[PDB]
Design a protein around this ligand. Structure first.
Ligand SMILES: CC/C=C\C=C/CCCCCCCCCCO
Length: 140
């Protein structure tokens, strides 16, 4: 649902300021986060990719091989309202995106591709929340 996806989004984005500090990222990536869920908006900036990658790592959603950690991704989804079924459906979308994307050895670009593919799948299911929810109040 969009309600669960909003809650996941807010919690995924809560470390954005911490990640910008760690990676010394410029404020030019902010607009990409404010528009993250805007239908048909494509994020292209690799640095935004590095931020998304950092956010995923903060939630321990990257395994030892650079792929989705399914158990921890499920833990995160369920904490914020997903049942077993939704957790598995979300994890299957991400895994499918990993398998579908143009391969890229730049992990910031790889994460950006997976995030854009996932966003499209969530729009396809009509589960997208309002465009700016990943940011919530983190940048205020
Ligand atoms: C799990 C996503 C839930 C809410 C908001 C945004 C997620 C989009 C990025 C999905 C992460 C894909 C690759 C990094 C995650 C772990 O490898």
């Amino acid at each position: 649902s969009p309600e669960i996806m909003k809650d996941l989004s807010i919690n995924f984005g809560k470390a954005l300021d911490t990640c910008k500090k760690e990676l010394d990222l410029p404020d030019s990536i902010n607009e990409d986060f404010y528009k993250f869920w805007k239908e048909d908006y494509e994020i292209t900036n690799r640095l935004t990719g590095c931020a998304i990658k950092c956010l995923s790592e903060k939630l321990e959603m990257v395994d030892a091989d650079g792929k989705l950690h399914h158990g921890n991704a499920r833990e995160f989804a369920m904490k914020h309202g997903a049942d077993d079924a939704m957790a598995k459906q979300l994890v299957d979308l991400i895994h499918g995106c990993e398998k579908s994307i143009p391969p890229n050895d730049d992990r910031c670009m790889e994460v950006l591709s997976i995030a854009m593919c996932f966003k499209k799948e969530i729009h396809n299911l009509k589960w997208a929340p309002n465009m700016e929810v990943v940011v919530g109040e983190v940048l205020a």
